[PDB]
Amino acid sequence: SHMCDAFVGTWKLVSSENFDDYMKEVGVGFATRKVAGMAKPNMIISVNGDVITIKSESTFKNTEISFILGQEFDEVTADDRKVKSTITLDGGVLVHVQKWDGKSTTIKRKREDDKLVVECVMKGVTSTRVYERA
Ligand SMILES: O=C1C=C(O)C[C@H](/C=C/[C@H]2CCCC[C@@H]2c2ccccc2)O1
Numbered sequence: 001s002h003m004c005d006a007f008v009g010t011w012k013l014v015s016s017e018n019f020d021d022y023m024k025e026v027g028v029g030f031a032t033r034k035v036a037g038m039a040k041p042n043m044i045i046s047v048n049g050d051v052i053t054i055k056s057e058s059t060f061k062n063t064e065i066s067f068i069l070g071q072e073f074d075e076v077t078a079d080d081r082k083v084k085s086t087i088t089l090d091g092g093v094l095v096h097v098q099k100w101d102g103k104s105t106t107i108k109r110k111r112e113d114d115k116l117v118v119e120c121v122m123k124g125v126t127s128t129r130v131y132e133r134a
């Protein structure tokens, strides 16, 4: 309990850097990158017992995952990858690893001041996405 209290809430994207390059590294195609890159999602995080739910809602896609920390799950990403995901808490940071077709990408979410900072990494390419409370 209270594992993720400082994450819970509704959050709105306010800045993005290097996201197109992250998506290219993942293998996202041109049209999806362009429409996805335009999106201004809200991220809605909630907890009920051991189950964490993260929703991403935008004009591009509305997605939802629910999970228990450390317990793998199957996820269809907004770009239609079929991945195996595990999310853990590492020193206060939510670490989300996605595996597919022999590839891996990690998305970290952390609280920094009044922001929720999301770092997306695929090999040598990192993208930073900043969210504030809605
Ligand atoms: O937790 C988060 C917070 C973030 O802002 C982005 C991050 C990754 C999402 C992208 C992965 C690659 C394909 C496009 C995906 C996408 C989904 C929804 C809306 C736009 C772009 O997920």
Ligand SMILES: [Cl-]
Pocket (backbone or CB within 6 Å): 016, 017, 018, 019, 020
């Ligand atoms: Cl960007």
